[PDB]
Design a protein around this ligand. Structure first.
Ligand SMILES: CCCCCCCC/C=C\CCCCCCCC(=O)OC[C@H](COP(=O)(O)OCC[N+](C)(C)C)OC(=O)CCCCCCC/C=C\CCCCCCCC
Ligand SMILES: CCCCCCCC/C=C\CCCCCCCC(=O)OC[C@H](COP(=O)(O)OCC[N+](C)(C)C)OC(=O)CCCCCCC/C=C\CCCCCCCC
Ligand SMILES: CCCCCCCC/C=C\CCCCCCCC(=O)OC[C@H](COP(=O)(O)OCC[N+](C)(C)C)OC(=O)CCCCCCC/C=C\CCCCCCCC
Ligand SMILES: CCCCCCCC/C=C\CCCCCCCC(=O)OC[C@H](COP(=O)(O)OCC[N+](C)(C)C)OC(=O)CCCCCCC/C=C\CCCCCCCC
Ligand SMILES: CCCCCCCC/C=C\CCCCCCCC(=O)OC[C@H](COP(=O)(O)OCC[N+](C)(C)C)OC(=O)CCCCCCC/C=C\CCCCCCCC
Ligand SMILES: CCCCCCCC/C=C\CCCCCCCC(=O)OC[C@H](COP(=O)(O)OCC[N+](C)(C)C)OC(=O)CCCCCCC/C=C\CCCCCCCC
Ligand SMILES: CCCCCCCC/C=C\CCCCCCCC(=O)OC[C@H](COP(=O)(O)OCC[N+](C)(C)C)OC(=O)CCCCCCC/C=C\CCCCCCCC
Ligand SMILES: CC(C)CCC[C@@H](C)[C@@H]1CC[C@H]2[C@@H]3CC=C4C[C@@H](O)CC[C@]4(C)[C@@H]3CC[C@@]21C
Ligand SMILES: O=c1[nH]c2cc(C(F)(F)F)c(N3CCOCC3)cc2n(CP(=O)(O)O)c1=O
Ligand SMILES: O=c1[nH]c2cc(C(F)(F)F)c(N3CCOCC3)cc2n(CP(=O)(O)O)c1=O
Lengths: 294, 49, 276, 135, 140, 126
């Protein structure tokens, strides 16, 4: 059948925000608003109902001094002001122990998930480009279809430039590799299980069969081989000879087969250096604004 | 669907009503086996499974 | 005298925290190793998840005479197993997958499988691909006149897409459903945020109490003597009632009856300290 | 400029010549040059603070550009090295091939360049708290 | 289903539970003014307001990020007041400011009687509204 | 607008990269940002060191030595080997135990030649 061919899902180009991957994008947002939140409730309990020093500029500095584990300089002295420091401290012992713990889970067990998992997943996007052969059954199949998933998939490659078509099979293979997968070629599914199992192991067959054709041993019209062939192809398929001899040529007489955990590159934590220098440059702009104010 | 009761060699069921006269077509899920394409003819498969 | 109590308490909070960070990093990297069954072979090795086949039909008969040897090991399980992995009916075989969570992995034909995942309730799905390749067919009787035009019609309906328009119209369109995040979500660390906000709420509540107590008193000796001996002779008797009337450790010893997992006891116990 | 393969040492420029595409640094090229510019204008205001002592704020404003030279150099360094590393990962794996990416000595200068041009900033900013705090 | 927006109603509830404590200590301090003291009522009531300006300013930036436009659209008519209550009566002094110089009159006191009823009305309206959508999300 | 010279500002940085804070703290909004985002820089670099040293030591603890035929059946990294003439090849070729059948399936279709010619050579490759 018609099936999809993409590059084996590569590790990453880890974008320079990737430090905050272990927690979700809704826990890091709950922290910031529970940062301001527990800084404020400290401030109310410190100024009102006094025993003081904790201004709203100084109670933010206590809670930044309690989340980054770097300790504090000014301890709360009241029964209600310590319970603010009591449950914000236990907050940061869990969220830092859930940050270290989940980041030790990314680096030990690395699983690469594929971007697409169907033809619908290729239809519900514009980021990855398709590709077929220019002249053949794979070409003609989308055009005469009316099933509306394979019709949306035809309207794209009808128009979209640069040219999504190829002129030979080895072209379409070598437009996935050399293309850092953005190009999903559409083979017949017997060649997808061939190019995957031949070196360099770079491409895999995702999803299932779109169409369903069938290869057949052909005999000329009204020949007397027409009956024994037909009753032997069925006989081989039941005696497991058309499968044992499929495992041999695609897989067994084949490549790939069935880690090391390298050190963290600069690029993984490179998002923090940019926040560091940008956190400096914004402070030196506060230096000039404070000085001109004086 | 079909059987070959080996004590009596009688086709049963759907193939047993299409060998033994009283049907002309069997548009239904018949699995293309070997023992069935010796007594009745099948089309090319409409559904792969 | 006091820098020892502050000494070994410090060392106590270096081991309890570093046995918490280093154990929460052993849940989250052992449920990340957990891979779903996505092949025959990945169900060959699992002795935990059990197999399953209807007790009469081509599906058993495929494994018994198989020589592909992934399937031979799979038949090697299904003979020698307890209890019976072979269900009798595909109504039962589905109903074991429905009930027995993650244990039972019934093996059936692909076009019966896709019309059960899209049929109420959606409690099942098809993993992996096809093991073998059968084919359905239209049966012409032996040599009749309707044997070559039917064959030339079922090629025409295959190419125009009527056999695909008709599959989507009965498997999918009259269906009953549609069609990993790799990170901690707010459900995981939930109770920290409750103990936070619930913690702050107890602070401002006591901040009202703190305000009323030491400011409206603006506009002791015997109480310690009273309450402490009260706490004494109660707490002297608290451990006294504890050390007798033997209820320290229940032990609901039991066995598993694997049908619905049917937790059934074997004995019980309430050992005190010298009295079982 | 190639050294071993195509042995002739022809110094291409990846602006529009011709896997080794090398335009990973092309996104990160201007950032040592930007730091070089703030080090030029800091050096201009270095000695004219010495020539005239009568103007007050001469060491500090100059001293800003000595620090901004260094911080722009670090972001120059990181985005250089960040752009090398990811290009060394998206290469399709082959266990018959090795990619070494050992650094030169101008990068060793640029590393040492940070150390000196921050020292120039710290020394100039101590000059401000002996000059102006007396004057 | 504890999401981020479900957290935001939890936080603004326990915050506005001391916003009603602001206004109750705000009305009783001015009950001591017109009945029953200009420079003490200066000091105590200059303090209380700048929280209840700013904490409600927190509430408007929170539900912006929680994408709760209904509850965002609710608070902005109180914010429209406080954005202009920052602007209106900027009395004098170059100090922080508020509610403080030359009170016990008829004009500014009615401008302060507008504060005494409308603030406690909204903050006890909000405390019941926040407990609505807090529970409404967590059981959904 | 002191206590914060370069002999004390190289100490609220070394007292912050190691997570043990010193007695010096910034008291201005200009300086509590530099002390702010440096703190957050030493929460990510340390917790990407503890959580990576716990990913060497749990990935070289998974490493199991080959202690069976089957545990050499699955490894496509470690290569097989048999002398090129004798009963040892002839055992695999006619084997039906099917652990060994996969092992013969490797040794035909492999590059380069896994079959040494002599047991002096075959040892010398090990
Ligand atoms: C009080 C807070 C005190 C200190 C905190 C300082 C805040 C951060 C300082 C600036 C950091 C920054 O802003 O780093 C610039 C980001 C990164 O650039 P990029 O994501 O486009 O990567 C493009 C990569 N290439 C070109 C290959 C496609 O750019 C962006 O603003 C990304 C857009 C999202 C906005 C968040 C940026 C950081 C937070 C600011 C608050
Ligand atoms: C506003 C103020 C309160 C914040 C909202 C509280 C909340 O939204 O309530 C939700 C949780 C539910 O949790 P559940 O386990 O009861 O579910 C029981 C499940 N069912 C019934 C099926 C057994 O209730 C809770 O736990 C609330 C969290 C506090 C109670 C835990 C006890 C220890 C912590 C006390 C906090 C202060 C300690 C000292 C500082
Ligand atoms: C004195 C300054 C300049 C004088 C001229 C050079 C002498 C020392 C500078 C230097 O660097 O020698 C140059 C070497 C280059 O020859 P090669 O051995 O690399 O290639 C040999 C292999 N072939 C030829 C096959 C490619 O480059 C190397 O040494 C590369 C060694 C690693 C590069 C960075 C080392 C320092 C990094 C940061 C410094 C920050 C702290 C400094 C205190
Ligand atoms: C910051 C800001 O705007 O001024 C906050 C103002 C004045 O600042 P201060 O504390 O140094 O007054 C002097 C210190 N004392 C309170 C002990 C006399 O009054 C305050 O504290 C009220 C601050 C309480 C609520 C702040 C919420 C802001 C967060 C998000 C909204 C944007
Ligand atoms: C104070 C204590 C609790 C508040 C008063 C008790 C009233 C019921 C609250 C309660 O404890 O039950 C919890 C119920 C949820 O259970 P459900 O049956 O709705 O299932 C969910 C069905 N679904 C998804 C269609 C809504 O919450 C609900 O009513 C969810 C619907 C929201 C409407 C009532 C919210 C609670 C009252 C708020 C105003 C209180 C001011 C009093 C003056
Ligand atoms: C962009 C600028 C936005 C904010 C503008 C700041 C207002 C400036 C101001 O009005 O005063 C400036 C003061 C500086 O005081 P200083 O340099 O003489 O320190 C004395 C050093 N010692 C303690 C060692 C003796 O800085 C301050 O405190 C600022 C006043 C406190 C309120 C700021 C709260 C905002 C918190 C976070 C925002 C990010
Ligand atoms: C405790 C406080 C905050 C701790 C958590 C820090 C992270 C905040 C969460 C966040 O999501 O923010 C991260 C930002 C960078 O932005 P992004 O990666 O999310 O871009 C969008 C990324 N995309 C495009 C993939 C969605 O990182 C940042 O710079 C923000 C955090 C910088 C470190 C603390 C700021 C120091 C200044 C403090 C001022 C007051 C201190 C007392 C005076
Ligand atoms: C103080 C000096 C160094 C200048 C001010 C800080 C520099 C580092 C600032 C802080 C936020 C930065 C950014 C940081 C990251 C992005 C994405 C990266 O792909 C290219 C650099 C780029 C686009 C920025 C360059 C410059 C930048 C604006
Ligand atoms: O020709 C055959 N066609 C079949 C077609 C189907 C269906 F899928 F319904 F189309 C099924 N089912 C699948 C599961 O068991 C209940 C019904 C059985 C068939 N059988 C019996 P087999 O021996 O088990 O293959 C045939 O013999
Ligand atoms: O009867 C036999 N006895 C054998 C005895 C030995 C030894 F171990 F030295 F005793 C060996 N070697 C092992 C390795 O190769 C060099 C010598 C080969 C033998 N062979 C040839 P085979 O066909 O390889 O078994 C026989 O035929």
């Amino acid at each position: 059948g018609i099936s999809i061919m993409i590059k084996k899902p590569q590790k990453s180009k880890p974008g320079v925000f990737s430090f905050l991957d272990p927690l979700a994008y809704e826990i890091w947002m709950c922290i910031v608003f529970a940062y301001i939140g527990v800084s404020v409730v400290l401030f109310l309990v410190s100024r009102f109902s006094p025993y003081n020093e904790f201004g709203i500029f100084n109670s933010l500095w206590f809670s930044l001094g309690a989340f980054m584990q770097q300790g504090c300089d000014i301890s709360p002295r009241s029964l209600s002001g310590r319970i603010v420091g009591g449950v914000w401290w236990f907050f940061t012992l869990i969220i830092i122990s859930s940050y270290t713990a989940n980041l030790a889970a990314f680096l030990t067990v690395e699983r690469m998930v594929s971007p697409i998992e169907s033809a619908e997943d290729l239809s519900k996007q514009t980021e990855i480009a398709y590709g077929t052969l220019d002249s053949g059954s794979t070409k003609e199949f989308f055009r005469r279809s009316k099933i509306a998933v394979f019709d949306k998939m035809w309207t794209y490659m009808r128009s979209a430039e640069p040219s999504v078509f190829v002129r030979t099979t080895a072209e379409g293979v070598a437009r996935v590799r050399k293309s850092k997968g953005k190009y999903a070629y559409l083979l017949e599914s017997t060649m997808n299980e061939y190019i995957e199992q031949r070196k360099p192991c770079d491409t895999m067959k995702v999803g299932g069969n779109l169409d369903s054709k069938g290869y057949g041993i052909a005999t000329p019209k009204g020949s007397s081989l027409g009956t024994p062939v037909n009753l032997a192809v069925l006989k081989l398929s039941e005696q497991g000879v058309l499968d044992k001899l499929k495992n041999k040529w695609w897989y067994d007489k084949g490549e790939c087969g069935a880690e090391k955990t390298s050190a963290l590159s600069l690029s993984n934590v490179a998002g923090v250096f940019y926040i560091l220098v940008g956190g400096l440059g914004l402070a030196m702009l506060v230096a000039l604004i404070e000085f001109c104010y004086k | 669907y079909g059987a070959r009761d080996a004590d009596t060699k009688i086709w049963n069921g759907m193939v047993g009503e299409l060998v033994y006269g009283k049907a002309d077509i069997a548009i239904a899920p018949l699995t293309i086996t070997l023992v069935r394409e010796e007594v009745i003819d099948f089309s090319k498969p409409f559904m792969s499974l | 005298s006091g820098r020892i109590v502050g000494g070994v308490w410090w060392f106590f909070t270096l081991i309890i925290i570093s046995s918490y960070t280093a154990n929460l990093a052993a849940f989250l990297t052992v449920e990340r190793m957990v891979s779903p069954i996505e092949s025959a072979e990945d169900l060959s090795k699992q002795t935990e998840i059990a197999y399953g086949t209807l007790d009469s039909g081509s599906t058993k008969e495929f494994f018994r005479r198989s020589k592909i040897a992934v399937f031979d090991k799979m038949w090697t399980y299904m003979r020698s197993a307890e209890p019976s992995v072979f269900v009798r009916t595909t109504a039962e075989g589905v109903a074991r997958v429905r009930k027995s969570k993650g244990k039972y992995a019934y093996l059936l034909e692909s076009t019966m499988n896709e019309y059960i995942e899209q049929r109420k309730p959606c409690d099942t799905m098809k993993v992996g691909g096809n093991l073998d390749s059968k084919g359905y067919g239209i049966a012409t009787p032996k040599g009749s006149s309707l044997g070559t035009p039917v064959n030339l019609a079922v090629l025409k309906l295959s190419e125009q897409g009527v056999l695909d328009k008709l599959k989507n119209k009965w498997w999918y369109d009259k269906g009953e459903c549609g069609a990993k995040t790799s990170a901690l979500s707010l459900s995981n660390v939930a109770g920290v945020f409750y103990i936070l906000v619930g913690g702050l709420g107890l602070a401002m509540l006591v901040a009202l109490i703190e305000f009323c107590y030491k400011s409206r008193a603006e506009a002791g000796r015997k109480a310690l003597t009273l309450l402490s001996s009260v706490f004494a002779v109660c707490g002297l008797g608290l451990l006294g009632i504890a050390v007798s009337t033997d209820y320290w450790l229940y032990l609901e010893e039991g066995i598993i009856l694997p049908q619905n997992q049917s937790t059934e006891v074997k004995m019980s116990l309430h050992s005190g300290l010298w009295r079982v | 400029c190639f050294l071993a393969g195509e042995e002739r040492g022809r110094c291409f420029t990846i602006e529009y010549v011709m896997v080794n595409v090398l335009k990973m640094i092309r996104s990160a090229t201007p950032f040592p040059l930007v730091s070089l510019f703030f080090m030029f204008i800091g050096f201009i205001l270095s000695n004219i603070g010495h020539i005239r002592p009568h103007r007050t704020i001469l060491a500090f404003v100059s001293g800003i550009f000595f620090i901004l030279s260094g911080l722009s150099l670090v972001v120059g360094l990181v985005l250089y090295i960040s752009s090398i590393n990811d290009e060394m990962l998206n290469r399709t794996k082959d266990a018959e091939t090795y990619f070494n990416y050992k650094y030169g000595w101008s990068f060793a200068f640029a590393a040492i360049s940070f150390l000196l041009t921050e020292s120039a900033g710290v020394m100039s900013v101590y000059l401000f708290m002996k000059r102006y705090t007396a004057e | 289903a504890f999401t981020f927006a479900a957290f935001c109603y939890m936080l603004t509830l326990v915050l506005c539970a001391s916003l009603i404590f602001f206004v109750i200590w705000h009305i009783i301090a001015f009950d001591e003014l017109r009945t029953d003291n200009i420079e003490r009522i200066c000091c105590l009531l200059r303090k209380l307001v700048v929280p209840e300006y700013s904490i409600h300013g927190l509430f408007c930036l929170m539900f912006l990020c929680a994408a709760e436009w209904v509850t965002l659209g609710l608070n902005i008519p109180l914010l429209f007041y406080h954005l202009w209550r920052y602007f209106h009566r900027p009395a004098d002094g170059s100090e922080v400011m508020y509610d403080a110089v030359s009170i016990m009159n008829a004009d500014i006191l009615n401008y302060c009687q507008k504060e005494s009823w409308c603030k406690l009305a909204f903050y006890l309206l909000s405390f019941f509204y926040y407990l609505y959508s807090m529970v409404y999300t967590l059981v959904s």
